[PDB]
Amino acid sequence: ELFESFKSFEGLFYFLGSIVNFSQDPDVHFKYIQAACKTGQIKEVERICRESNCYDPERVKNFLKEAKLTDQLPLIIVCDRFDFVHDLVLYLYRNNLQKYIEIYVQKVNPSRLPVVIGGLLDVDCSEDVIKNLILVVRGQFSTDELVAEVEKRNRLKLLLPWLEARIHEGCEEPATHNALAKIYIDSNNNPERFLRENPYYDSRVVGKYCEKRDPHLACVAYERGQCDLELIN
Amino acid sequence: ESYVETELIFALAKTNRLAELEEFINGPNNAHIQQVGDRCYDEKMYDAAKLLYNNVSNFGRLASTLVHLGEYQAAVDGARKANSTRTWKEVCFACVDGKEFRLAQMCGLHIVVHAD
Amino acid sequence: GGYVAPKAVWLPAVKAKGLEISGTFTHRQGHIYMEMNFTNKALQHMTDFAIQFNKNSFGVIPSTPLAIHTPLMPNQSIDVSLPLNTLGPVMKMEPLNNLQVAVKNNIDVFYFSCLIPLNVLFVEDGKMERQVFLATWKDIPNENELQFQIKECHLNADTVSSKLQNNNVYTIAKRNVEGQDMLYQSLKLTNGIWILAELRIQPGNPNYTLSLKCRAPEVSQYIYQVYDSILKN
């Protein structure tokens, strides 16, 4: 407080930046952060803000959404470290999103792809950029929950080119293959020839789908899967 | 704060001073909608959570508040983009009760995808 | 193996500039250890660890330097087994089993105390011959005899005996007296002090009477405490 009494440019800033070593009062550390932002050098501090995580990211994030920097990207890190993704990407749609989401999923984490995309669909975004980011190289991904949030939104019609390019080389993922099966259910035809030359999809899955729809197709479904008792039932 | 501001707009609903509330709101609110924003229609003090959820784009919730409010045309006008199974059953049952039937079927189109 | 209390926090990080120590004591095949976990909750590397004890009732000291050879990095947590012996200076403390400790690192020296469970001081050669037991019991002044209650115990004499034996408390004789089991037991501390005991188990009584005779009766309360712990754990 005697520091901040004056201008208190950065002296006791460096002082804490030394003392931070086993310094567990996160409030003074956040004030220290504010200082690092006075003349922005959080660059070399945001890194330890990744390490130092004994604080309350709420008023922190508020300070951030007041701290204008236009290229900060620890806010995303603390965000998904505490899962403030909803309101974060919310204000992000409010102002702008071009690559922040993208640079996050590429360098930081392609894990939360599907959930954030579902958020985008919730905020009723522009599908094109979703296509584009899908084109952007990723790491890992789980399709099941993605198409689940889809079936909530009912707007899968857009990863299908991704599946096209992907199976274009022939990834034998029963996941993506039954996803194809779903989009073909949507396509409203008879891929029994496809159903047979594709052993990759899950017949049990497509059958438990078409329970209502198409027993005349659950036939060949269970016949690929030899699900005779299910065929009976 | 948020407390000050949230309960502030809450009391503003208590005093129905919307025509200046929502206008002040455009500033750095530092508050949290959808909590007092809830309380608005919760306390039936409508027409504001209308505006709140508007400036937060809370489709359906806002449309439901239109319903309880008696607003029914712009209700479907928001449902056309909201398009949640909720939105659809809302507009269906309400508009039937609203005794509008033409637009009722016009919106009932969008549910028949679900035979349930 | 005998009873070993779960580790407890001995020195919290916030009182020690980020150093957190948890600990317990064990006795392993005639050898006493102070088993600890050191965690660095600070932002500086910690080095130059050292430890010493104040003079204490049973002459407990570390027998070697503290075996921490690498810097303990921020967020790291190591297990440290410090061998102890009872060859050190003796000063009678209150409570009798209290141990004052100083731990140093490159940041500062920190102080804490902890209580030594006396069973780690129960030696292997503590089984009195029946003849000697009777004579010693009789030799010790009757005023030295102290009575304690092991509350809510339901172990059979046999189980009592086996558990105690595992902690170097030997059953010398058992007397069945109208349903009651009377167990006569001996144990011997690292300082040579014998403690004789009569445990009375009665039918319908959920509480056992532990009667202890010692030439240094001040010790008795503490034997009772750990006797109780061994039976309840």
From Swiss-Prot, chain C:
Q: What is the effect of changing residue 138 to E?
A: Strongly reduces interaction with ARRB1
Give the sites modified to Phosphotyrosine: 33, 224
Compartments in which it is found: Cell membrane; Membrane, Coated pit
Q: What is the effect of changing residue 198 to A?
A: Strongly reduces interaction with LDLRAP1 and ARRB1. No effect on DENND1B-binding
Family affiliation: Belongs to the adaptor complexes large subunit family.
Assembly, in brief, is: Adaptor protein complex 2 (AP-2) is a heterotetramer composed of two large adaptins (alpha-type subunit AP2A1 or AP2A2 and beta-type subunit AP2B1), a medium adaptin (mu-type subunit AP2M1) and a small adaptin (sigma-type subunit AP2S1). Interacts with EPN1. Interacts with EPS15; clathrin competes with EPS15. Interacts with SNAP91; clathrin competes with SNAP91. Interacts with CLTC; clathrin competes with EPS15, SNAP91 and PIP5K1C. Interacts with LDLRAP1. Interacts with AMPH and BIN1. Interacts with ARF6 (GDP-bound).
Q: Which protein are we looking at?
A: AP-2 complex subunit beta
Q: Which organism is it from?
A: Homo sapiens
